[PDB]
């Protein structure tokens, strides 16, 4: 879970404007019922929100899957 937050914050730092940064955080929140492309269809507050929501959703969902299939690197 900490790895997810780190990678999401890394992307969110690239959105210097308030609305896309918040849309990044929104897209990175868990939705175990839908894909990123299904979820971003509901974003209606403009193209910068669409882009950031989708990008951070994509990053977060990829890390969720990696955490499930491989998980934490141990022994460091």
From Swiss-Prot:
**Subcellular location(s) of the protein:** Secreted
Q: What does this protein do?
A: Mediator of local inflammatory process released following cleavage by C5 convertase. Acts by binding to its receptor (C5AR1 or C5AR2), activating G protein-coupled receptor signaling and inducing a variety of responses including intracellular calcium release, contraction of smooth muscle, increased vascular permeability, and histamine release from mast cells and basophilic leukocytes. C5a is also a potent chemokine which stimulates the locomotion of polymorphonuclear leukocytes and directs their migration toward sites of inflammation.
Q: What range of the full-length protein does this chain span? A: 680 to 755 of 1681
The segment(s) forming the Anaphylatoxin-like domain are 23-57
Protein name stated in the entry: C5a anaphylatoxin
According to the UniProt record, which cysteines are disulfide-bonded? 23-49, 24-56, 36-57
Superkingdom of the source? Eukaryota
The gene from which this protein is expressed is: C5
Q: Where is this region: Involved in C5AR1 binding?
A: 17-46
